[PDB]
Amino acid sequence: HHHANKEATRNAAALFSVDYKAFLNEVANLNKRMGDLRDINGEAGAWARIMSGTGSASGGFSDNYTHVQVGVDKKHELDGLDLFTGFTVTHTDSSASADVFSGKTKSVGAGLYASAMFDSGAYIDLIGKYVHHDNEYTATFAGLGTRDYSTHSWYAGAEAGYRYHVTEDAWIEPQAELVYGSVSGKQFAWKDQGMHLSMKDKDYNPLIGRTGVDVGKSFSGKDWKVTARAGLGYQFDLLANGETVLRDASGEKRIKGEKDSRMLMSVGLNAEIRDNVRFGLEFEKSAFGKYNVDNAVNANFRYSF
Ligand SMILES: CCCCCCCCOCCOCCOCCOCCO
C-alpha cells in the first residue's frame, strides 16, 4: 500500500508537472526576444522570433516545443536613452512524454513591453503578458485515459543588466531577471475498477529568478556588424507554492511543489545588415536541474524604420 501510494504520487506529479514546463517555456529575456536594441536609428520596429527546443527530466520525461512570436513597437528618443514600447503575440506547440503519459499543448499569448537602452550601457526590460493553454494528455495509469483541459498564465517580468566595455570591440554584461507568474489549477475526477478517484491541484504562482553574465566580441564594416557572444547563467525557483491532492476512497494524499534550479549556457551572434535589418541567433542548454533544456535554438529578426 505504501508502494502503491509512492507510484501514484510519482505519476500524478509527473503528469501535472507539464503545466509548469508550459509556463517555463514562455520565459525568455531581452536578447532572446528582441535581439540587440542598442544604437538603433529607426523610430519604429517590427520583429519576429522563433524558438525550438527539447528538454528532459526523470521518469523518462522529455518534451519539445516550437515557439513563435511577433511584435511591433515605437522607439522614443530621450536624453541618452532609447525606450521601446510595444505589443507582442505568441504561439506555442508542445508535446510531452514520460513513462506513464503523453500529450500536447497549444498556446496563444499577448503582451506589452517596455525596453530601456541607456547610452551608459545599462538596460531595463519590462514585460507583462497573458497566455492561454489548451491541453490534451493521455495517461497509461489508473485508467485515467485521455484528458483535455485549459489553463492560462499571467507573466510579469523585469530584467536589468549592464554592458561594460573592456575594449572598443569586447564587452562583459551581468544580468538579473525576475519573473512572477500565475498558473491556473485543474481537476480530474474519474472511476477505475468501480472506485471514485480524484486528482487536483490549485492555482499557484511561479517566481523565477536568473543571474548571469554575457560576453561579446564584435566585428564590423561601414555597413554591417557581427557580434559573437556567449552566456553563463543561473535560473532558479524562488517559490514552490503549488500542491497536488490525490483523493481516494481510503483518503487524501497531498503533494507539495518543489523548487528546481539549473545552470544556463548559451552561444550566439547578433547581426546588423545596413540600417534596418537585425538578426539574432543562439544555441542554448542547461545542466544540473531536475528538468533541463537539453538543447534549443532561438532566432529573431528586427526590421527598424
Ligand atoms: C512588470 C510589468 C510591467 C509591464 C510594462 C508595460 C509598460 C510599457 O508598455 C507600453 C506599451 O505601449 C505600447 C506602445 O504602443 C505601441 C505602438 O507601436 C505600434 C505602432 O507601430
Domain ranges (residues) in the chain:
1-305
Distance 25 CA to ligand 1 centre (A): 22
Distance 127 CA to ligand 1 centre (A): 8
Closest C-alpha to ligand 1, atom 21: 73
Whole-angstrom distance, CA of residue 132 vs CA of residue 92: 10
Closest C-alpha to ligand 1, atom 16: 86
What residues contact residue 278 under an 8 Å CB cut-off, 6+ apart?
35, 36, 40, 270, 271, 272, 301, 302, 304
Confirm or reject: Cβ of 85 under 6 Å from ligand 1.
yes
Identify the three-state secondary structure at position 94.
Answer: strand
Closest CA to 206 of 267, 144, 155, 135: 155
Starting from the edge strand earliest in sequence, which strands make up the sheet with 195-201, in order?
A: 187-192, 195-201, 243-248, 251-256
Q: Tell which one of 125, 126, 178 to mutate to probe ligand 1, the residue whose CB is within 8 A of the most ligand atoms.
A: 126
List residues in the chain that are followed by a break over 2.5 Å (C to N). Answer: none
Q: Are 197 and 190 within 8 A, CB to CB?
A: yes
Closest C-alpha to ligand 1, atom 18: 73
Is the dihedral angle over the CA atoms 224, 228, 234, 235 positive or is it negative? positive
Closest C-alpha to ligand 1, atom 8: 114
Distance 134 CA to ligand 1 centre (A): 27
Q: Which helix (H) or strand (E) holds 205?
A: none
Confirm or reject: Cβ of 126 under 6 Å from ligand 1.
yes
Is the dihedral angle over the CA atoms 115, 116, 121, 122 positive or is it negative? negative
Any bridge partners for residue 55, and if so which?
A: 63, 293
**Strand-strand pairing, 207-221 and 170-181:** antiparallel
Q: Which CATH superfamily is domain 1-305 in?
A: Autotransporter beta-domain (2.40.128.130)
Closest CA to 299 of 105, 49, 90: 49
Confirm or reject: Cβ of 27 under 6 Å from ligand 1.
no
How many residues does the structure list for the chain?
305
| Residue 114 alpha carbon, nearest atom of ligand 1 | 8
Q: Are 200 and 151 within 8 A, CB to CB?
A: no
Task: Tell me the structure's resolution in angstroms, rounded to a single decimal.
Answer: 2.5
What residues contact residue 108 under an 8 Å CB cut-off, 6+ apart?
89, 90, 91, 92, 131, 132
Confirm or reject: Cβ of 173 under 6 Å from ligand 1.
no
Q: Are 297 and 43 within 8 A, CB to CB?
A: no
Closest C-alpha to ligand 1, atom 1: 156
Q: Are 154 and 74 within 8 A, CB to CB?
A: no
Distance 46 CA to ligand 1 centre (A): 13
**Interior CA angle at 55 toward 3 and 246, to 5°?**
30
CB burial readout 143-167, b (16+ within 10 A) else e: ebeebeeebebebebebbbebeeee
Distance 67 CA to ligand 1 centre (A): 21
Task: Take residue 13 and report the three cell numbers written for it.
Answer: 506529479
Confirm or reject: Cβ of 59 under 6 Å from ligand 1.
no
